[PDB]
Design a protein around this ligand. Structure first.
Ligand SMILES: COc1ccc(Nc2nc(-c3cccc(C(N)=O)c3)cn3ccnc23)cc1OC
Lengths: 6, 274
């Protein structure tokens, strides 16, 4: 929710 | 930089935990005094050199920094696992603090965000890019003293460049990132000013998450349409105006931390006078 992967 | 495991006393109580491992409170024996510390401990679950290198790179950035508004590193320790030992900021993350202390005054919030701008003015002067500037990464020493922490994604800029170009996109805090970061993988101190705008929004919203209910892709789409988050309840207009200026789409026309800190400094003195 805070850190998004590509 | 290398510490003695014998001189370090860790508590059984864990402060927090991530994918890197855990954070524990402890005390470290100095020349005479004992120093309260926060210790980042690597997970020794599966042998992974990527976490070790990340922790050592973080230590290398922290070692180079010397400012009252930045968390100080005591050193590193190699024992049961790799440990990064820091001076404890007793009151913890700013977003969690404000969520639990909803009666903090606007004057006190301005004071804390201005302290963060003084720390960021110093990082910009030092040519380091933070890359994870968010309310969760601002730690409180007291209710009136904030410090910047978490140099996990930070980079020392090359002597011939004003920005760091990331090779491949990874697990990023996209809601805090500027359009040139998402579109060109370029990170400068101006990119950190964009994040600071989001941090201000979080602080005046008493630790609420930004872009509530939205995915990273929907935020990019929203920003590309010229839309920005609204003014939080009770936030002074001058502070919302400053947030919008940090949210300048074009990096070339966005202010630097020297301009932002000065604007916050003068507003704070005006508030103090009232
Ligand atoms: C009221 O609760 C708190 C009181 C104090 C603290 N202090 C500190 N916490 C961390 C920390 C914590 C969790 C994750 C990470 C990380 N690296 O992801 C870092 C680092 N620090 C450096 C100096 N002081 C601290 C934290 C609290 O809640 C978490």
């Amino acid at each position: 929710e805070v850190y998004e992967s590509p | 930089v290398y510490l003695d495991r014998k001189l370090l006393t860790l508590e059984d109580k864990e402060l927090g935990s991530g994918n890197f491992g855990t954070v524990k409170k402890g005390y470290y024996q100095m020349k005479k005094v004992v120093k309260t510390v926060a210790v980042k401990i690597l997970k020794n679950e599966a042998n992974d050199p990527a976490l070790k290198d990340e922790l050592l790179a973080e230590a290398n950035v922290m070692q180079q920094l010397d400012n009252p508004y930045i968390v100080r590193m005591i050193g590193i320790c190699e024992a049961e696992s790799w440990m990064l030992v820091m001076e404890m900021a007793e009151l913890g993350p700013l977003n969690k603090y404000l969520q639990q202390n909803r009666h903090v005054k606007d004057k006190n919030i301005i004071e804390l965000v201005h302290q963060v701008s003084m720390g960021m003015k110093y990082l910009e002067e030092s040519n380091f890019v933070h890359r994870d500037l968010a309310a969760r990464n601002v730690l409180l020493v007291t209710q009136h003293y904030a410090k910047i922490s978490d140099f996990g994604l930070s980079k020392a800029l090359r002597a011939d460049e004003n920005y760091y170009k990331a090779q491949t996109h990874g697990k990023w805090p996209v809601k805090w990132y500027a359009p040139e970061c998402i579109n060109y993988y370029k990170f400068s101190s101006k990119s950190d000013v964009w994040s600071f705008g989001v941090l201000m929004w979080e602080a005046f919203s008493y630790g609420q998450k930004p872009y509530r209910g939205m995915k990273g892709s929907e935020v990019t789409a929203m920003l590309e349409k010229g839309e920005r988050m609204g003014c939080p309840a009770g936030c002074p207009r001058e502070m919302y105006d400053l947030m919008n200026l940090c949210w300048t789409y074009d990096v070339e026309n966005r202010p630097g931390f020297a301009a932002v800190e000065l604007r916050l400094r003068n507003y704070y003195y005006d508030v103090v006078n009232h």
